[PDB]
Design an enzyme around this catalytic site. Structure first.
Site, PDB file in Angstrom:
ATOM      1  N   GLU A 296     -40.712 -72.598  24.115  1.00 12.81           N
ATOM      2  CA  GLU A 296     -39.701 -73.250  23.305  1.00 12.81           C
ATOM      3  C   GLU A 296     -38.539 -73.772  24.136  1.00 12.81           C
ATOM      4  OE1 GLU A 296     -41.206 -70.343  22.374  1.00 12.81           O
ATOM      5  OE2 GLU A 296     -42.506 -71.383  20.951  1.00 12.81           O
ATOM      6  N   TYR A 383     -52.046 -78.964  23.553  1.00 14.58           N
ATOM      7  CA  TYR A 383     -51.493 -78.003  24.507  1.00 14.58           C
ATOM      8  C   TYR A 383     -52.256 -78.066  25.831  1.00 14.58           C
ATOM      9  CZ  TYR A 383     -49.277 -73.302  25.298  1.00 14.58           C
ATOM     10  OH  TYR A 383     -48.582 -72.240  25.816  1.00 14.58           O
TER      11      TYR A 383
END
Ligand SMILES: [Zn+2]
EC number: 3.3.2.6
Length: 609
Positions: A296, A383
């Site tokens: 994050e 990802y």
């Protein structure tokens, strides 16, 4: 006009752009509604603009006011998961770059897909309810009317009225609190976001929250039951931020707060600007999972600052984020560790492609979501296939310090903007114009637009992984005559990450004969580990091999927290193990009221209740 984003029904960014949102709302926990006004400052990109369209989903509109007078508006027919377009008739014709403020009085639906209302029983503290939003991908339109597309970026300010016993937080800098002048039972919390964001990053939490300061620009927030543990677990956040700044350029968002969600939270983290959401299953007690929030943290450059223009290009966000995140971890633990994480990533891409099928359209890097709900399109492919492309290019173009120069220039070039894969590739070619002959050997068609595994595998250092493999191939190919040959020393030089990797490889070949796992407990004592990643894979291995001792331990982990990644497969194993099936169904019924409603529903479906 050019239509940018087919997942949005609103006027496209080529026609008009929302520059700012002023949100004044009130959270009603009795009705499970957000009510108030959304004032959008909109800038026309055309001449003679006389109407515009916003996304909505399950909103009730009371009125629309422009320049002091109510204006006409019309809601269009619902288009499945995209919601209903809202057309607003302007009182004047706008010219290019001319601005207008549109104030919409609205109320959300209690069934709003963006807003997760928890009962007291679903919180840590068991007295107060709790609210958190989850707008990604296209749920902001179920909170307020907007151009609900990451092709538009706006600043915002907010004023949120809540019961005075509770606290509001948003993806913004806190800007003070006062009593609600219209209601002494309530407080108004203010917020300001001076960096333009795509609206899927608008976020709101309301609950019984407390904080600890753990850095010059970091508070950690949680219910009182978790806040002290969290302040310790994440005490190194600031040092990670400094590393990310060195790798990607300045952090532009001011504050970096953390919110540790309630145990019932079914998801992983979320990169909400100025307020990263953290799953409480990272609270291992030894900080062995604290580096996970580097994901994050990294989005503060890649995704939040440079944003994908549509959801078809989401790999640009996740891919560059994972690339930066693995550099943060390479700084913390060494280049061999960056390669360890990268190689594990390649393994996850293999599993993802095998699960979808190697021809599945979702194993493409650039996906066409024309008639696909982007809210249900997430996988490991953006990802890990995105990371793999970037790691391949790094190795092709002269290594990590050179490619890190590209990353920094890419962030600087596209900060505060929204871009496509072709924008990215054009910039790659411009930055590396000195190396075009190398770039032109890349099979861009395969990498970007073809399903399945990538056409080339990068070069991975095997140092840290070979240790785990060595031990993995020793237990599996062993007989009762060799079980006494194992001892504690086998784990002497293995990190928690390597322990996790060993259990991953061992579980992949489950079941093991009971004698082995019994032995494995005797010498390794994996029953004692609290790291949620390690404890999870260990307990699955015990159930899938039919050990009695494991039934209570797995039932406990499955109900103490609600992260789907753990809770669902545990109940699946316990249901599949005939010895524990009856007890697993009975435990689910006893605890389902304290679970998140979606976890309760899916485990119920699995348990066939
Ligand atoms: Zn992410």
């Amino acid at each position: 006009p050019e239509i940018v984003d087919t997942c949005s029904l609103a006027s496209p960014a080529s026609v008009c752009r929302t520059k700012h949102l002023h949100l004044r709302c009130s959270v009603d926990f009795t009705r499970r509604t957000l009510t108030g006004t959304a004032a959008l400052t909109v800038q026309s990109q055309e001449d003679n603009l006389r109407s515009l369209v916003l996304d909505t989903k399950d909103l009730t509109i009371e009125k629309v006011v422009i320049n002091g007078q109510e204006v006409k508006y019309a809601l269009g027919e619902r288009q499945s998961y995209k919601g209903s377009p809202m057309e607003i008739s302007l009182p004047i014709a706008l010219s290019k770059n001319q601005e207008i403020v549109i104030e919409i009085s609205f109320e959300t639906s209690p069934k709003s897909s963006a807003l997760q209302w928890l009962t007291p029983e679903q919180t840590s503290g068991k007295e107060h309810p709790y609210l958190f939003s989850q707008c990604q991908a296209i749920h902001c339109r179920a909170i307020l009317p907007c151009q609900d597309t990451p092709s538009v970026k706006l600043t915002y300010t907010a004023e949120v009225s809540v019961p005075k016993e509770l606290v509001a937080l948003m993806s913004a800098i806190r800007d003070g609190e006062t009593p609600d002048p219209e209601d002494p039972s309530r407080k108004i919390y203010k917020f300001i976001q001076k960096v333009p964001i795509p609206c899927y990053l608008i976020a709101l939490v309301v609950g019984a929250l407390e904080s600890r300061q753990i850095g010059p620009r970091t508070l950690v927030w949680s219910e009182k039951e978790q806040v002290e543990k969290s302040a310790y677990e994440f005490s190194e956040t600031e040092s990670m931020l400094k590393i990310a700044e060195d790798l990607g350029g300045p952090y532009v968002w001011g504050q970096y707060d953390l919110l540790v969600l309630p145990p019932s939270f079914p998801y992983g983290g979320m990169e909400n600007p100025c307020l990263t959401f953290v799953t409480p299953t990272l609270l291992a007690g030894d900080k062995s999972l604290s580096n996970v929030i580097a994901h994050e943290i990294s989005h503060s450059w890649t995704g939040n600052l440079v944003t994908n223009k549509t959801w078809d290009h989401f790999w640009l966000n996740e891919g560059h984020t994972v690339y930066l995140e693995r550099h943060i971890c390479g700084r913390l633990f060494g280049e061999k560790f960056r390669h360890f994480n990268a190689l594990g990533g390649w393994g996850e891409l293999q599993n993802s492609v095998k699960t979808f099928g190697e021809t599945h359209p979702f194993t493409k890097l650039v996906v066409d979501l024309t008639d696909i709900d982007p809210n249900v399109a997430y996988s490991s492919v953006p990802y890990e296939k995105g990371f793999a492309l970037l790691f391949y290019l790094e190795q092709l173009l002269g290594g990590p310090e050179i490619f890190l120069g590209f990353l920094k220039a890419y962030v600087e070039k596209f900060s505060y903007k929204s871009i496509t894969t072709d924008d990215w590739k054009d910039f790659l070619y411009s930055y590396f114009k000195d190396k075009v002959d190398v770039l032109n050997q890349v099979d861009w068609n395969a990498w970007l637009y073809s399903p399945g595994l990538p056409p080339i595998k990068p070069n991975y250092d095997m140092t840290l992984t070979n240790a785990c493999i060595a031990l993995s191939q020793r237990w599996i190919t062993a007989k009762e005559d060799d079980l006494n040959s194992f001892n504690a020393t086998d784990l002497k030089d293995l990190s928690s990450h390597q322990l996790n990797e060993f259990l991953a490889q061992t579980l992949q070949r489950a079941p093991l004969p009971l004698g082995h796992i019994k032995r494995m407990q005797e010498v390794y004592n994996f029953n004692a580990i609290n790291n949620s990643e390690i404890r999870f894979r260990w307990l699955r291995l015990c159930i899938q091999s039919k050990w009695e001792d494991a039934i209570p331990l797995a039932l406990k982990m499955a109900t103490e927290q609600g992260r789907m990644k753990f809770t669902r497969p545990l109940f699946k194993d316990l249901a599949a193990f005939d010895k524990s099936h009856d007890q697993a169904v009975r435990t689910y019924q006893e605890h389902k009221a304290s679970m998140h409603p979606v976890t309760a529903m899916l485990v119920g479906k699995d348990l066939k209740v």
